[model samples]
Target: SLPACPEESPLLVGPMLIEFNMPVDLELVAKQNPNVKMGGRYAPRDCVSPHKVAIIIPFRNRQEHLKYWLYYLHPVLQRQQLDYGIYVINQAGDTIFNRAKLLNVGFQEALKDYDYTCFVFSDVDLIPMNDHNAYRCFSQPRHISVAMDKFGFSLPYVQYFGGVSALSKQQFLTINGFPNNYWGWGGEDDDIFNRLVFRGMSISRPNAVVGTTRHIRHSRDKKNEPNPQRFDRIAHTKETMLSDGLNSLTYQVLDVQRYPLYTQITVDIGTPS
Candidate 1:
């Protein structure tokens, strides 16, 4: 019933302005993005978007960073003209943060509500600076945040896929989703990389200019200390890939809240044993 959208979105305006010193008001952001329905769903009225994407953010207590992220990226994503929904998979309580598990939960939970064609697993603190860095999935896994201000607008390494990435439903399922046992930060992204490689999928990235992003810097969380077992876990990804990902993910839902700009799914990811 809708016309197909153009090859390139007419709404994109190149680089965006980002500010973090001042707090962002949710009400103001909501007012600014009137087209965004409750639970962060948005589809272009003018045309049928090619991709239905669900953005899954593994979050803990980074409320301040989230405000900024929504304030900036809502406009950018809207400009990209995608049929998209934002899902913030927040972990409940103060247990050690299992980022990968929360993301796995997000992938599962979001599917229950919408048949999303692509899933973008992103850290809450990172915000894309360019509208051209489309969040849609490619034939190969897409690494959206290829360059960041923290890394002097450069990729720190070729294998880095930590901040933000996208995968089609088939691509994600082929690798069995992200590893669930990476309780703390660092190793999970690498484990995911290995999974993609093991499954014969390669990572794709946009040019640095188009993929530029800004990160909201903050000190590490209390319980989210470095995972001492990260190296061992990463080394065993080939062996563990078959057993420890979405196929084995488990969590308890704490709450599900829908705001004007996003749906927040809070889950109790059990403590690392």
Candidate 2:
């Protein structure tokens, strides 16, 4: 069964529809749209009705991988019958690949649109194999991706924490979202782990039986060049997270592109070398 909506959780700004499989009125959806930058404070339109959520993807190139994600995940999310919006945080013209920082930017940019209670941090190539994996908030941090091909369909390790994750606005702000310095991959997730630990919080994973992932067919992109200094930067996450995050974040929105279904923002950064 899908998890019940958390009434008190800061993740969801409003109440969720009780049933997940209920049919949505596409006609009504169509009547509301054709919005040009018409969504919420972030953009301009107010589609956020019952349960408001922001699906943030820190995207760069690899358009093919994105196509797969949007194709599979959008329907699954709609099946949950929750009000949500999609935002792709694209890295600007020539920028480094700082996944975590872009995530931070996503949060900042998302808030400008609506009062998103739950923020879903997701990768472009990942899709859930289990339908029962409710994408909502919890009293504790929630790991939506409990099983992934990257770890052979198991938690990567005891410390294995990566892939689609959800956190309430409170939980995210408490840790300053994620570390922004670790460009490329490998350390930011660990640093985020430290943030939860520091706040006396732990991660909540979907039950192994319920948490499964489809093996995304992609090798890897050249833009995501691994950073050698990631480990070293992760070491100080606890020390600096509070002071240096979304508020202390330093970057600019180079460009933003909108579509009928979603919007994309190209941000300037330094990762690709």
Candidate 3:
């Protein structure tokens, strides 16, 4: 049985400790939770959760990392007592990986099936070291990964909007979603910050005291070359916000898998020129 939702609420304390060791039996771990929905969606079977959320992860070929993510996050989210669904928006084929574009695809794709009030765009490799961070939205936008182990459990910079974040549907659409032209890492996060500012949204973050998180270490994927145009693109984010965003997203679904832990939606997100 799950924890009671009042004084005994799961989110009342924090998440169980996850060490994130590799080469573990993830399949065995998945088998332990036999009650999660077929599409990796869950709600407290006994009570109604106040918020409906979609956790959208932009992904490619990172299976072992993903396995660890699922192994840890499924239970974490459940404990948070959210009516939530996990959507791993996998980009099919190895092309110049546009991280923000895939995230845009995830926002659109997840909305097709559920009226999710909140969207959490998380990097597949980030695992929250503390559950009190709560994967939910705020009045403004929310930066969930406040204290990453990489940054000595501190915010690296004030405008850092990478790793994990939450936004209400209106808040996300207002910023026009992330810029699609950032064909690799770097500028997308900054562009997201600029867009939020362009639309008058300030970021909200948990106290660093309870927001600790850890990033699974990995070399950059071969297809994810650093974007040389990042600085240039970031300089013009406000100008591009209206035309080159959610309203302009395009893609094709290649396949979709509804696993016990999450729904894996693979898509053809196009090759970057």
Candidate 4:
């Protein structure tokens, strides 16, 4: 059973039920999904365009974690009352770590269904804890994951970039999207930071408290090592961003799954498997 939600109509509504290996305040979560909203009647700034925005999540076999991610995120997103869809970009066959390229495929596939003005590139294991964290784009690029409970509700580090992030369509293209060469985890985020800076843009983050996340605890995946070649790349960012960013990007779509609130597009670059 789930909490009573007047916002959900008797005919169309289904109560959200979640299961976790560890403890969860499902009762509290039930209280949070009571179809709430703020601000005035649908202003232009408040709505996402194409009547939709796609949330692209790169995933492998984290089924249990994803079950929680969707269970938690969808209802909150619905209460926010924007037209959106969810996409789970699962690597169909064996593909090595290629986070950046799957995101590129996500960017490409999201445009296929609608004129999605916003694109959220997210990690499957991260869950946003606050309803005030609006899932939309802005004048400046937005970093939705400012705090994660895993790091005492702080960002992993100044350069620590994991979890959820988003960008407007125009903003993403300005930097030609993310770098395609990062085979492992660490460098892609830095390279992306470089692209943002090179384009004369700065990263924007919500307040740490509002942006806090409930992280799924797990050990690091095998071979997710930091790139040995990531120093000068961070230093000479402006140059490489112009010369070696998405223009050099490459990949193939593995699968694309769509949900009512957002769509997930999977891709493969066949990295170090």
Candidate 5:
């Protein structure tokens, strides 16, 4: 019923476009892919994939946007024949909303369940516009959202590792995980890029034509605006990184539930300091 290691078939890459105007029904999409197990994990029935991946999404209150993301990504990931699982790491309270810290927590929690070799830190609001872009890890850190609609289908900046991207387990730990102090948007991505270089790794990407993504537009959360200290914190990344990273990550899991499409892990990362 399935090919042996379908991921090896070059058919993994091609052109794709996200058409959200057409109404998406998650329940309907779920019925179409019944093999997807509870806890949002799926592996090829025929063969083992070269890599095991975890799609780690740092989330807040964005259920509608998440529905669209799941509607599209589940199909694309399955088609790629990846041994993958999806984990939505949700911040439980009205905190400062740290994107990167949540990602660190996600990385740890995911490992407790499966030995994932790769992790994709994705925004719930971002959707892959092309399935050919592929969601698996590369030889180096990969920035999958190269051409996004927000920047007129071009990268907003060269050091941009925002939106969607993947990093192998080894590479992620080498950076000591993202800075936990970047409490809000703006600096975390740049901080991550800096960490990558600091550890002698380079960022890689698909050609602009193939690595495309769509970001669902949203008004900034009242609690989440641009972080003013981003610049200063980024400048000191090399200094504080060792202490304020995965080694120091602390959180209380409010709940862990397995849905048809993903495992939702709600955590109280402490009120924003």
Candidate 6:
């Protein structure tokens, strides 16, 4: 057995500077995180982590954004002293970028490799600006990216549960996982919020300073336009929760590549029907 890490990580510095305009190199990131094993796994040598986390990014075509995320996050996660792995769930042959479905795929695939107790679902473009915004789950579901640079460092709305969030395996299953039918971006986060509410789970969050994040600016991707059915689908979240989540998810794994900084799972999630 290993000794437990301290409640507060000693390596944490309140805030961090993230340079989005500057180009990031994966090779440099690999050299910086030499302790990170292939497939992006890491653990503290001196103490055991309280959480075994899987950092999942539902990705499409945002390599540059991902580079910045990996460049910034690896150090933060390492300092937090958590046993963790990073999984980039890529949607193949973009039929329409199903962000939520890809996240569900990340959860399912990450678990097969290790007994990950926590899942941090994040967008490739968003990077937490504060190391105190830990990428770990809580008894209640955690919404980590609370104050974003795009939103003037304040939450867009009270119900907003997007950008970055964490949930334990049991908390995830309690809500039947995320809606696989949200073929586009807008409503899925709200749908997830509704699921947590339906199950009597509340959202947990850190102080605005600790939860701050920076979103790498970029125009939306080609296939991922505004989802027209978003409002309609969101309004019916309660009715659809049981029938349209993990139980009904379907996808095909095209490839799994183990890289020095992350594991890339390329999948062919079917088009919106």
Judging by lDDT against the true structure, name the best candidate. Answer: 6
The clash tally of candidate 4 reads 11
Model 5 TM-score is 0.94
Looking at candidate 6, what is the lDDT of residue 154?
A: 87
Give the alpha carbon lDDT tens digit for every residue of 16-81 in model 2. 222222334433443444332232112212233345678888887766666556555555565554
Which residue pairs clash in candidate 6? none
RMSD of every candidate to native, in Å, equals: 0.9, 7.3, 2.6, 8.0, 2.0, 0.8
What lDDT score goes with residue 155 in model 4? 78
**Backbone Cα, N, C clashes tallied per candidate:** 0, 17, 0, 11, 0, 0
Q: What range of 10 consecutive residues in model 1 has the weakest lDDT sum?
A: 178-187
Task: Estimate, for each residue in 4-117, the C-alpha lDDT of model 3 and write its tens digit.
Answer: 455335455564576766575656766876668788888888777766899999888888888888888877787878888989999888788888988888889899878898
Residues 52-102, model 5: lDDT tens digits: 999999988988888888888887888787899999999987868888988
After superposing candidate 2 on the true structure, give the runs of residues whose Cα lies further than 4 Å from its correct spot.
Answer: 1-50, 270-273
CA lDDT of each prediction against the hidden true structure: 0.91, 0.70, 0.85, 0.65, 0.85, 0.92
Per-residue error at 135 for model 3, in Å? Answer: 0.3
Once fitted onto the true fold, the runs of candidate 6 whose alpha carbons sit more than 4 angstroms away are none
- lDDT, candidate 5, residue 190? 90
Output the worst ten-in-a-row residue range by lDDT, candidate 6. Answer: 217-226
Candidate 4 Cα misplacement greater than 4 A, ranges: 1-19, 22-51, 159-161, 257-266
Summarize candidate 6's per-residue lDDT along 1-273 as a digit string, tens digits: 778999889999978888888878899999999999999999999999888999999998888888898999999999999999999999999588899999999999999999999999999989888899999989899999999999999899998999999999999999999999887658899999999999999999998888889988888688878899999988998989989989998889999999999999999999877
| TM-score quality measure for candidate 3 | 0.94
- Ranking of all candidate structures by their lDDT, best first: 6, 1, 5, 3, 2, 4
Q: Is candidate 3 or candidate 6 better by TM-score?
A: 6
What candidate 1 gets wrong by more than 4 Å, as runs, is: none
